[PDB]
Write a protein that binds this ligand. Sequence first.
Ligand SMILES: [Mg+2]
Ligand SMILES: [Mg+2]
Ligand SMILES: [Mg+2]
Ligand SMILES: [Mg+2]
Ligand SMILES: [Mg+2]
Ligand SMILES: [Mg+2]
Ligand SMILES: [Mg+2]
Ligand SMILES: [Mg+2]
Ligand SMILES: [Mg+2]
Ligand SMILES: [Mg+2]
Ligand SMILES: [Mg+2]
Ligand SMILES: [Mg+2]
Ligand SMILES: [Mg+2]
Ligand SMILES: [Mg+2]
Ligand SMILES: [Mg+2]
Ligand SMILES: [Mg+2]
Ligand SMILES: [Mg+2]
Ligand SMILES: [Mg+2]
Ligand SMILES: [Mg+2]
Ligand SMILES: [Mg+2]
Ligand SMILES: [Mg+2]
Ligand SMILES: [Mg+2]
Ligand SMILES: [Mg+2]
Ligand SMILES: [Mg+2]
Ligand SMILES: [Mg+2]
Ligand SMILES: [Mg+2]
Ligand SMILES: [Mg+2]
Ligand SMILES: [Mg+2]
Ligand SMILES: [Mg+2]
Ligand SMILES: [Mg+2]
Ligand SMILES: [Mg+2]
Ligand SMILES: [Mg+2]
Ligand SMILES: [Mg+2]
Ligand SMILES: [Mg+2]
Ligand SMILES: [Mg+2]
Ligand SMILES: [Mg+2]
Ligand SMILES: [Mg+2]
Ligand SMILES: [Mg+2]
Ligand SMILES: [Mg+2]
Ligand SMILES: [Mg+2]
Ligand SMILES: [Mg+2]
Ligand SMILES: [Mg+2]
Ligand SMILES: [Mg+2]
Ligand SMILES: [Mg+2]
Ligand SMILES: [Mg+2]
Ligand SMILES: [Mg+2]
Ligand SMILES: [Mg+2]
Ligand SMILES: [Mg+2]
Ligand SMILES: [Mg+2]
Ligand SMILES: [Mg+2]
Ligand SMILES: [Mg+2]
Ligand SMILES: [Mg+2]
Ligand SMILES: [Mg+2]
Ligand SMILES: [Mg+2]
Ligand SMILES: [Mg+2]
Ligand SMILES: [Mg+2]
Ligand SMILES: [Mg+2]
Ligand SMILES: [Mg+2]
Ligand SMILES: [Mg+2]
Ligand SMILES: [Mg+2]
Ligand SMILES: [Mg+2]
Ligand SMILES: [Mg+2]
Ligand SMILES: [Mg+2]
Ligand SMILES: [Mg+2]
Ligand SMILES: [Mg+2]
Ligand SMILES: [Mg+2]
Ligand SMILES: [Mg+2]
Ligand SMILES: [Mg+2]
Ligand SMILES: [Mg+2]
Ligand SMILES: [Mg+2]
Ligand SMILES: [Mg+2]
Ligand SMILES: [Mg+2]
Ligand SMILES: [Mg+2]
Ligand SMILES: [Mg+2]
Ligand SMILES: [Mg+2]
Ligand SMILES: [Mg+2]
Ligand SMILES: [Mg+2]
Ligand SMILES: [Mg+2]
Ligand SMILES: [Mg+2]
Ligand SMILES: [Mg+2]
Ligand SMILES: [Mg+2]
Ligand SMILES: [Mg+2]
Ligand SMILES: [Mg+2]
Ligand SMILES: [Mg+2]
Ligand SMILES: [Mg+2]
Ligand SMILES: [Mg+2]
Ligand SMILES: [Mg+2]
Ligand SMILES: [Mg+2]
Ligand SMILES: [Mg+2]
Ligand SMILES: [Mg+2]
Ligand SMILES: [Mg+2]
Ligand SMILES: [Mg+2]
Ligand SMILES: [Mg+2]
Ligand SMILES: [Mg+2]
Ligand SMILES: [Mg+2]
Ligand SMILES: [Mg+2]
Ligand SMILES: [Mg+2]
Ligand SMILES: [Mg+2]
Ligand SMILES: [Mg+2]
Length: 203
Amino acid sequence: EVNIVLKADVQGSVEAISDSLLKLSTDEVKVKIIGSGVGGITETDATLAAASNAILVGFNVRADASARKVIEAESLDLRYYSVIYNLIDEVKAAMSGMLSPELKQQIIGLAEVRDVFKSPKFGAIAGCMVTEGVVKRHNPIRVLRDNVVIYEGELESLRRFKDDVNEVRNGMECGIGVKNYNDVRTGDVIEVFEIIEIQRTIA
RNA sequence: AAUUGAAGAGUUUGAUCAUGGCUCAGAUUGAACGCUGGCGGCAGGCCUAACACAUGCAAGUCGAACGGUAACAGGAAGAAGCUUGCUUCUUUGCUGACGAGUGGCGGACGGGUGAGUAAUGUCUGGGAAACUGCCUGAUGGAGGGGGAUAACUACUGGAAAC
RNA sequence: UAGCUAGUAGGUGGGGUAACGGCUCACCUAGGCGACGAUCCCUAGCUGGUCUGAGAGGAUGACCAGCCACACUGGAACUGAGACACGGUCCAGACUCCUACGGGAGGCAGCAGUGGGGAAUAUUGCACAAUGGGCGCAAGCCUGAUGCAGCCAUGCCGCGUG
RNA sequence: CCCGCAGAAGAAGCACCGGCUAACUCCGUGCCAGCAGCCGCGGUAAUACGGAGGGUGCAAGCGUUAAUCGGAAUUACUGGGCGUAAAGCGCACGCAGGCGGUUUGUUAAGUCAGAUGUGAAAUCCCCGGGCUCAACCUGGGAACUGCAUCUGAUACUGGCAA
RNA sequence: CGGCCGCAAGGUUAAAACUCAAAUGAAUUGACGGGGGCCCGCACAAGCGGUGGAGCAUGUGGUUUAAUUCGAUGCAACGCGAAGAACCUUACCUGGUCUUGACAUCCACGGAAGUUUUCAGAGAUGAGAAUGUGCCUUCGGGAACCGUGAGACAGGUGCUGC
RNA sequence: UAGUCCGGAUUGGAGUCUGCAACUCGACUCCAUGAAGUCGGAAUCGCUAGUAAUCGUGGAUCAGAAUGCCACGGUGAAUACGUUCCCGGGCCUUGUACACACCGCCCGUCACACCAUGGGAGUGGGUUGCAAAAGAAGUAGGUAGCUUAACCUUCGGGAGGG
RNA sequence: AAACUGGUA
RNA sequence: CGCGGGGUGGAGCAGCCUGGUAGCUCGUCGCGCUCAUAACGCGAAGAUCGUCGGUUCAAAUCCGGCCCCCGCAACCA
RNA sequence: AGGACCGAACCGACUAAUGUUGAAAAAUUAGCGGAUGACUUGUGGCUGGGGGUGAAAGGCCAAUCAAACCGGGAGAUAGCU
RNA sequence: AGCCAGGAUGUUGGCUUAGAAGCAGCCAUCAUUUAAAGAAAGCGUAAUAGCUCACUGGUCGAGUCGGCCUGCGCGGAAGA
RNA sequence: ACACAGGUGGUCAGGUAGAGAAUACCAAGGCGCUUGAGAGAACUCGGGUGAAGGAACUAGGCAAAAUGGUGCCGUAACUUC
RNA sequence: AAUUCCUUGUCGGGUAAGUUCCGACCUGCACGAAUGGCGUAAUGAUGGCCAGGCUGUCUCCACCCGAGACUCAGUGAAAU
RNA sequence: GCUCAACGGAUAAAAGGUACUCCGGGGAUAACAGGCUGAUACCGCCCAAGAGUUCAUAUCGACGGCGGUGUUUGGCACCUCGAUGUCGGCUCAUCACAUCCUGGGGCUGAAGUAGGUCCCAAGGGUAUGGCUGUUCGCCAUUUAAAGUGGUACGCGAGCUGGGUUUAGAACGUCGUGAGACAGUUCGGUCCCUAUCUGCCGUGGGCGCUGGAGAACUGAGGGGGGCUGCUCCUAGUACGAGAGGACCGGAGUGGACGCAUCACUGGUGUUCGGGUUGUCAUGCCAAUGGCACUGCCCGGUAGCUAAAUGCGGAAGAGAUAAG
Ligand SMILES: [Mg+2]
Ligand SMILES: [Mg+2]
Ligand SMILES: [Mg+2]
Ligand SMILES: [Mg+2]
Ligand SMILES: [Mg+2]
Ligand SMILES: [Mg+2]
Ligand SMILES: [Mg+2]
Ligand SMILES: [Mg+2]
Ligand SMILES: [Mg+2]
Ligand SMILES: [Mg+2]
Ligand SMILES: [Mg+2]
Ligand SMILES: [Mg+2]
Ligand SMILES: [Mg+2]
Ligand SMILES: [Mg+2]
Ligand SMILES: [Mg+2]
Ligand SMILES: [Mg+2]
Ligand SMILES: [Mg+2]
Ligand SMILES: [Mg+2]
Ligand SMILES: [Mg+2]
Ligand SMILES: [Mg+2]
Ligand SMILES: [Mg+2]
Ligand SMILES: [Mg+2]
Ligand SMILES: [Mg+2]
Ligand SMILES: [Mg+2]
Ligand SMILES: [Mg+2]
Ligand SMILES: [Mg+2]
Ligand SMILES: [Mg+2]
Ligand SMILES: [Mg+2]
Ligand SMILES: [Mg+2]
Ligand SMILES: [Mg+2]
Ligand SMILES: [Mg+2]
Ligand SMILES: [Mg+2]
Ligand SMILES: [Mg+2]
Ligand SMILES: [Mg+2]
Ligand SMILES: [Mg+2]
Ligand SMILES: [Mg+2]
Ligand SMILES: [Mg+2]
Ligand SMILES: [Mg+2]
Ligand SMILES: [Mg+2]
Ligand SMILES: [Mg+2]
Ligand SMILES: [Mg+2]
Ligand SMILES: [Mg+2]
Ligand SMILES: [Mg+2]
Ligand SMILES: [Mg+2]
Ligand SMILES: [Mg+2]
Ligand SMILES: [Mg+2]
Ligand SMILES: [Mg+2]
Ligand SMILES: [Mg+2]
Ligand SMILES: [Mg+2]
Ligand SMILES: [Mg+2]
Ligand SMILES: [Mg+2]
Ligand SMILES: [Mg+2]
Ligand SMILES: [Mg+2]
Ligand SMILES: [Mg+2]
Ligand SMILES: [Mg+2]
Ligand SMILES: [Mg+2]
Ligand SMILES: [Mg+2]
Ligand SMILES: [Mg+2]
Ligand SMILES: [Mg+2]
Ligand SMILES: [Mg+2]
Ligand SMILES: [Mg+2]
Ligand SMILES: [Mg+2]
Ligand SMILES: [Mg+2]
Ligand SMILES: [Mg+2]
Ligand SMILES: [Mg+2]
Ligand SMILES: [Mg+2]
Ligand SMILES: [Mg+2]
Ligand SMILES: [Mg+2]
Ligand SMILES: [Mg+2]
Ligand SMILES: [Mg+2]
Ligand SMILES: [Mg+2]
Ligand SMILES: [Mg+2]
Ligand SMILES: [Mg+2]
Ligand SMILES: [Mg+2]
Ligand SMILES: [Mg+2]
Ligand SMILES: [Mg+2]
Ligand SMILES: [Mg+2]
Ligand SMILES: [Mg+2]
Ligand SMILES: [Mg+2]
Ligand SMILES: [Mg+2]
Ligand SMILES: [Mg+2]
Ligand SMILES: [Mg+2]
Ligand SMILES: [Mg+2]
Ligand SMILES: [Mg+2]
Ligand SMILES: [Mg+2]
Ligand SMILES: [Mg+2]
Ligand SMILES: [Mg+2]
Ligand SMILES: [Mg+2]
Ligand SMILES: [Mg+2]
Ligand SMILES: [Mg+2]
Ligand SMILES: [Mg+2]
Ligand SMILES: [Mg+2]
Ligand SMILES: [Mg+2]
Ligand SMILES: [Mg+2]
Ligand SMILES: [Mg+2]
Ligand SMILES: [Mg+2]
Ligand SMILES: [Mg+2]
Ligand SMILES: [Mg+2]
Ligand SMILES: [Mg+2]
């Protein structure tokens, strides 16, 4: 929800801008005008915009001293425009910004378990051979045993022989330590991936 | 004539008496809100932001203090196209008056507010070392001179204010 | 909140005010206030009165009347009998407005009225006919004081809805 | 303010009904929905919730909320308490402070008596008068319980002397 | 929290927000006590015979079933209601039937009651043939009883033993 | 002196009998088979005299049904020293924070939710003490600079003002 | 010798 | 190829110089005790001695193989 | 009074620059610490090497110290260059 | 292979359609009329239309089309 | 090792200013340091000044710059007072 | 944390931006009580961080004063 | 009679530390750098299921395949152990193009503006800070852009010394201990006068055919080449609107470079003045020396930046992609 507190100089302007803003309401995100009025921005308008995280917009009006008191004390998003199209552009920008970042995954590593070992803190650690890609320190992982998901989490411990490492490229041996992954069995595959964003926008 | 003045109840316990709190019945208000609403008389009406203000009005008056004709309500002279003796038009302060100016009185009253002030203010009761426009009583003067300035004219700076 | 005060308390002389006075200076003394509450901190205009109560007391100071303080904020003085002056002056400050960008103006806590705040509180009205003030010999002019009217069941009282 | 025409025509609502507290039945619901100042009602026969009928109270008003006093002798001066309900310091010595045996004299401070002055008006109260009654307005009185000065009393308290 | 005191532990002075309708003292009656005293019962002790072990009868719980009808549940339910479930009893299950009805009562019409057999069908049940057509009888009918029809009704071993 | 001439369940075959009806689901009889069971754990029950123990007979319900219920008789014991205790009950007294009356009441940590509150490195404001800098306007004091219509003058200038 | 506890209204 | 002890029922356990009916603690299913629960008591199911080969009426106790666990060595991923 | 304070002589050596075939085999310039004390200094004496001394750094013992210097075993040995 | 012509619609198939008869989209995945035509491959038209592909008629006229095996070349080919 | 910017104990110690044996200029006294003369370039060393900005420099305010005396007034948290 | 690998752990403060610093959290790889634990006024040519002043440290160097460097005369090295 | 099992059997009889170290050797053997290689990494290409509403190839692209570079992580041990100084920073650079900006084009799922992808192009240009030793990285805030790599991971006989491999000390951890950690923490000597090559400047000799003084031509070489914003065209083309051009002109900036002191300033120990202490010129007065030019205030010329003038071009020829 995008909350708007709209005050304009003329009632015709108020009633035109309200419907112009309502027309562009998308299913994913909507816009509500909690307050709509004619005249300068008042302390009541400031309080109403403080209650809900609203954008306090004045079409051809300016805040008085009393309203500016609350505006200074609590920092709200006060906006002054002179063109309905500028106001609509800003509202569309806010609506688009409110959207989700579109989390997506892609495989960047692959290892096969061999020669299970033991550890005091993490319990049973897996001695993996990286077959393709790269495996990083703290990235989400998926354990597959015969192409069926067994474990979902994040790679916690990654060292070689004796030294902790941040990454291991394909072709080297590595040790993977996940305390909750206690059913370590030879032949298991581990997929490593990261998270990518596309940052959708309304259109 | 002016002193005709004083009520209790519910609630702790199985029940009782105490102690002790809470609650209610009364009166009152610069009240607000809900439902409803015919008339009249008297009174009251920003208690919060001593927060900010568009616009109009709320302190003027004296020509019987004095220079004056900027309005113009009269009159007279004169010059004139003449209604043919009655009109008109420039001077003229004689004039009923009077914009602007000097001068006198008033603007310290009336009106508004409760910020500040814990006594440097207020209430009560006293005092001595004081002034007092206008209003009133009494006793006495009110003689003779001088130099300026506003207004008004001639220039000049100004968008305005000046 | 237990200690507070150096012009501080007293005296001589000068100065100053309408008037007494550390009111102000020079000098001399070390004094003065405080447990009967000094100093410090919080709150608040005071009274006649109003409410309540049998009374004593408790709460309160809205209207009317008396006194005090203030006039956008801070400061100063002039004029005047009387001001350290609500609709005066000068300086400084915050804010607002006009500008030809050279430069200027402003003070509703006066009566109406507007924005804002709030649960909440009215007409941008008529007249100087009466009373009372300012000027004037008077006539007369001015007077949002005042007299009236408009809005509100806000209160008290009276009548009707047969 | 008086007169004339017509016509019951234009004019009644709010709260409450278990006890406190004046006023009872039915239906719906079934610890749900709801009520509630206090005690507290509602878990299938509710005088306590919702509706209807009936009744009680007030009336151009009625009810709710806010605030003060009263009831509250529940800050007890009038007018309370501390063995066990709250409440005697663990005990003692002692400054300031409070109180103090008996005889006389004196003072006259406390105390009491009389007089004078004062205690604004309005408001409160008593007797009257005017708005068609009332509210309201208004004449006189009383009160304004206080404060100051003067003149006296000397029982008691205080001071001085013995 | 602040102040003072103490090496420390801590001591002394001493609140507010918030929450409840109570908290509390003395005493009365009852109950209870791993308090005391006295007394009684096949209560214990001293004995006999048992149950709990095995087979069987019966009831109950549980389970299953179309139904396994409904009750009764520590002592004080469990050979209990039940002093007699193969039909009935018997409500419960599945099927087949009826709607003023199996039973009471009001009304109309028709028909003696009853005794004999036959078709279909598990039966109930429908569907025929028979036989019979008597007492009172005011000669339009009643009383004993049968069939059909309408409406008031009849009916419930359905729930609440709080 | 044994799983037996004890023990009788189960089971097969064959029969008697009530009743419309013995298969779900009756009683009795004849032949055959002959399980478990050789005195029974924790625990628990009745009985003090014709009692217990054991042995037969009858009745109700009922067409047909008992090891159940009710009822009659034959044979016929052991042990009770005593109230020290389990259970229950009665009376007197005592303690109680109990009164849905000990199957009462009631405490604290810990897990969850909400409300207010203390400490807290810091952050943002208001007021104010002390020590300094700062000096608009105004008032007062002092003035070799400039300027000046009222008074004086020797007419050159003085006094005084700005 | 030991001898706990008792949902709410 | 790495230093010792082991392996009894669902879990933990007794039989060692003593090779003779598989027993005891805790768990599961019952019964009793109590108004009821806990506690407590009485009972039942439950087994190649970790797994095989020599020895032997016999079974880790006399031995020899296989498998598993643990004291450390067990690297350390 | 003080293993008190500031600060010269005096005793040190924290920073920087220079120098690094130096003026010097550790110094110069500018700063810096202590400066009545566990202080500093002159003269003389004692402790001798698997030993001494050490408010401890494996520090010092004549420009040399995880075992001083001089002479000898000695032409030690060197699977090494 | 060019050029001169046909090269269409039985039938807006149902439907959509700015104005869709093959071409902006679905079902339909068939067949006559026919020298010759697929209810159609596409530019194009505010859909047809205009203009085109397959097939065939005429003019022109002798070569033309696509595979296989082979020799030598071309691109793929950026570094201090 | 040098006619070496180093080290070396004691005694005397004047004037002006100054607390002073610090520091500055002088007296008595002693010295100009055993290669010079020119020029007035990069670069190095030792110094002075610097518009506006003022740590942005750097591992780091290194180095520089800055403060600096006597008298009087005044002075916080904390504290073993 | 003079102790924490993961690690620039998370939150708050400071900045404009803070792997450093200060205050907390506790998941203490791998604190801990005379190999002392936790505090602590004063002290320190001790380690870390911040602020005022100050500045050629720096943006970005410029000019000037002396000693060398350069030229002339005398003497006259060194590593390799 | 020996698990002399290290099994041709050094003793009957035997473990460690050295960062306090020392000697003799080795590039017969590692760490830095070079060399070979190219598994890995980076870049390119082949096929095309599929995504893209329809549509493989606007943009991506599964399962698979083929190459280039020398460029990361690796392999080898060929050079250097009678010495090739190692990370980061400063100063100074130079090359490649697989192009970050600027320039020219094709395609687009390119209406305009703004974008995506590919081709040609190396002339010029290509950030300051906060934190960390930090190259990198995150963050703040700019720019037209804040390019990727080679050069002994360019550059210590140019500088630094923060990290890191000496000696001191401590924490955690391991060890009985000496001690150790590729864990942390505080402190800790950076030498060289340039012979040759090279480079930046400046001279002498001879030659060029009689000698000498001048002015030239120009084979050849070097320097330079960057770019923002505002206005007009024009609120026009394009679009429903919002918004908003190509092409072509003008003006004013940033960085960089050259020149020059007319101006604004710095310096100006060679000019004038003020002033503290002290000494001297016989003394007063007036002067001089010393104390950083004693301290300080101004300031001529010259040199200078912060000051003010100019520059990068237009044009022509032959071309790359097209
Ligand atoms: Mg007027
Ligand atoms: Mg006039
Ligand atoms: Mg007044
Ligand atoms: Mg005097
Ligand atoms: Mg006085
Ligand atoms: Mg009372
Ligand atoms: Mg009061
Ligand atoms: Mg005056
Ligand atoms: Mg006035
Ligand atoms: Mg006004
Ligand atoms: Mg007003
Ligand atoms: Mg409002
Ligand atoms: Mg009334
Ligand atoms: Mg009643
Ligand atoms: Mg009901
Ligand atoms: Mg009272
Ligand atoms: Mg009391
Ligand atoms: Mg006592
Ligand atoms: Mg006493
Ligand atoms: Mg007495
Ligand atoms: Mg008296
Ligand atoms: Mg009357
Ligand atoms: Mg009266
Ligand atoms: Mg009065
Ligand atoms: Mg007396
Ligand atoms: Mg305290
Ligand atoms: Mg008996
Ligand atoms: Mg017994
Ligand atoms: Mg039995
Ligand atoms: Mg029932
Ligand atoms: Mg039953
Ligand atoms: Mg039941
Ligand atoms: Mg039946
Ligand atoms: Mg009952
Ligand atoms: Mg038999
Ligand atoms: Mg037997
Ligand atoms: Mg029978
Ligand atoms: Mg009895
Ligand atoms: Mg209990
Ligand atoms: Mg707090
Ligand atoms: Mg002044
Ligand atoms: Mg419990
Ligand atoms: Mg000392
Ligand atoms: Mg010192
Ligand atoms: Mg040192
Ligand atoms: Mg020195
Ligand atoms: Mg010291
Ligand atoms: Mg050591
Ligand atoms: Mg030595
Ligand atoms: Mg030795
Ligand atoms: Mg020998
Ligand atoms: Mg030899
Ligand atoms: Mg050898
Ligand atoms: Mg080829
Ligand atoms: Mg010499
Ligand atoms: Mg010497
Ligand atoms: Mg000496
Ligand atoms: Mg020089
Ligand atoms: Mg220099
Ligand atoms: Mg300097
Ligand atoms: Mg100078
Ligand atoms: Mg500067
Ligand atoms: Mg400056
Ligand atoms: Mg500064
Ligand atoms: Mg930097
Ligand atoms: Mg320094
Ligand atoms: Mg300095
Ligand atoms: Mg770390
Ligand atoms: Mg900083
Ligand atoms: Mg910290
Ligand atoms: Mg430790
Ligand atoms: Mg210990
Ligand atoms: Mg030389
Ligand atoms: Mg020479
Ligand atoms: Mg030589
Ligand atoms: Mg061998
Ligand atoms: Mg060490
Ligand atoms: Mg060696
Ligand atoms: Mg080699
Ligand atoms: Mg190498
Ligand atoms: Mg390599
Ligand atoms: Mg080899
Ligand atoms: Mg090499
Ligand atoms: Mg060599
Ligand atoms: Mg290219
Ligand atoms: Mg060119
Ligand atoms: Mg390098
Ligand atoms: Mg490089
Ligand atoms: Mg080099
Ligand atoms: Mg380097
Ligand atoms: Mg270092
Ligand atoms: Mg070039
Ligand atoms: Mg010049
Ligand atoms: Mg100058
Ligand atoms: Mg000079
Ligand atoms: Mg002199
Ligand atoms: Mg001299
Ligand atoms: Mg000298
Ligand atoms: Mg060109």
